[PDB]
Point group: C2
Chain length 412, copies 2
Amino acid sequence: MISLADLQRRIETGELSPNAAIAQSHAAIEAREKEVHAFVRHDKSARAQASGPLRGIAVGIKDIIDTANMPTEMGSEIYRGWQPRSDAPVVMMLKRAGATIIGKTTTTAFASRDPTATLNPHNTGHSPGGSSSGSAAAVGAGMIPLALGTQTGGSVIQPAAYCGTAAIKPSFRMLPTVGVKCYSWALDTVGLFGARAEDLARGLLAMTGRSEFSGIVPAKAPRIGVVRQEFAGAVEPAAEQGLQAAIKAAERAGASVQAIDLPEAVHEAWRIHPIIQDFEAHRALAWEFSEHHDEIAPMLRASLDATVGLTPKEYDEARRIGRRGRRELGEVFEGVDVLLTYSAPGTAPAKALASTGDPRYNRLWTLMGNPCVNVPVLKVGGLPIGVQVIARFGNDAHALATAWFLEDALAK
Amino acid sequence: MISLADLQRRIETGELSPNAAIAQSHAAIEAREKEVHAFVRHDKSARAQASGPLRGIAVGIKDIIDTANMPTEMGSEIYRGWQPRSDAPVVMMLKRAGATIIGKTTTTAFASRDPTATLNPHNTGHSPGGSSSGSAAAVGAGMIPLALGTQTGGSVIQPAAYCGTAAIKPSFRMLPTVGVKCYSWALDTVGLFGARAEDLARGLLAMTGRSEFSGIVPAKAPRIGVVRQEFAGAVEPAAEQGLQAAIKAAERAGASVQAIDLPEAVHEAWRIHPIIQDFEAHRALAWEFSEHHDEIAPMLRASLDATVGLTPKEYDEARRIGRRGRRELGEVFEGVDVLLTYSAPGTAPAKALASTGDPRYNRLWTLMGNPCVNVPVLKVGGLPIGVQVIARFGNDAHALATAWFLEDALAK
């Protein structure tokens, strides 16, 4: 994996040139695309920019995010050849900082469950996760130092964990979803994939200019609360293997680790996430569902079909529960600086299973809105396993800091 | 003006066929458009649907709202001939209910301050307000029974008042902003224009299927609190004349009216609205500002150029201020059912002034999120004057009921 912060430093000290950095990404892509299929399209003519903290940094954009110079096909035949007139605001944040939009990474149809052709970098016979399949896979394959994706269920954290890359889903609404194909406006949150927490941090700084992302250093003696999300069901062994490895490494590094059960109000929040997501999806994809029903990928078509009956009333009730959830979640953070849990059910599923993987350990947080970061921990049978670091809402900075700490802790 | 609730009833009993209803609108549009200039595009082939609560109901759509069968030019040369791929979700809500999208109404450039060529229905020498110029002018001229617009500052209520039509800016985020050109994602709220409060209710019921909009009837002896928003300065004579006429009609109708002072936190929220709005404006229009700066309409270009320096810091500070204002604003609604204030600074400005009007008496409420309803009161020199009925967040039904009440009261 290529490190964004690394490139920045080397480029900044004239040790490395922006054109060399971009040339390298093009090289890496060509080196593995016929193997990973992480790009819907690759702009080979992309060149480094002359100025900005991200000059010489190649970035892949999930194909549900608008680009003015490249098609944005939403991973659906319905939008084959579709060309947005403008770049999405998040894309402009990158371009303005000097970044190079090297290509559009694969996305499942409308960011749902229908698998793409992308394969896991660590094992061509396994899925790279979803829906940000291409972004995670591309970063995990060492093709690019940065990639943008989105999360509604767990499409940022989960795929990153499956591909063994660092990733973050900032606090809800921090990054605008303007020009980002909507699934659920109550949940949709843009995310970033990188090699390490530090890369994520620098990436966010360049995009937002928010001082909180400036000069972030590994956290010291973090106060951690471990939650195994019992309400989410039975976790796979490999996943628990990573969480224990992470807890152990953090304890050696000075972290205080105490297990804690999440309030009932939160369990309920996790339960009603589907209701909120699916009710809004029918509104958000009304044009597609009504005019191009049969053209909607199988899995997505099936879940929408199964939920055409959700009512505004039970939807309103779900949102009430959701709010109860946030209110009582904040209290849990009075005694701990962050929470540590699974980033996925286990190792990435074989491709033959025809599944991107169950986001049950990710969805609650997307609804609560807190910033989440995936920290690669270990590998089982060659497939990566990570843990998810979660901080108080609006505290992305500290989430990246502790994630960093965890990375260093794991490195012994 | 054309009443949606009336057509709906006559079509229901069979007295009027959907086809004849749409023929009515085409004719009404045909008879006044050449002088009002309210439509960017009039689809003369638009026909009625055979079913749905809105069958035979023609609706005008502000041109920053995506439509699949008609261009969406954002009131800007930059988007000349721009054709969205899909109908925006709010449009689909109308279509699915049986309504007919008869055309795209004029919108100022990217819904900002640069005037459109539309003229006030009551006096062609005056502005119809903005930025939803076309929707207001069209309904006010009796061309169509319903129209959609948007409000970031006061773009729904103010132009509604200027053109003497009923209108409602629903609770923030009730109606999705997907497919709606964004200005400020923390403010943008879709709104409706109609003959009376009741026509708004029927439209919302049909669009959302929410029970709170079903069976709405005029409120009885409503508890009203009058707020003159002193923080925004004194209003023009005509505006105060209408408010005084509304209070008297209300009292004489059985309502308890009391002058209320707004919590200081609220005054502050009004003060920082421009910071949240203008800061996000820069992220939401980044592509336009960077790639087509000179093509941006004069006024918008100047306001953008003047706010380039706004920082994430003062931005977050403004957001916090807005949240505290919302809290205390809710407190106010513990003794009163609705607030009664001004809809605009006075009568519509002369076109010669090249201004759509100052939204200072509207912006606060858009930031607070409360549902507001304009109620035409009287005219001065032939120019309409209205008042604004505001209920608590989530009490759209009550806002319409009280507005309906106030309408009867004014009709004595």
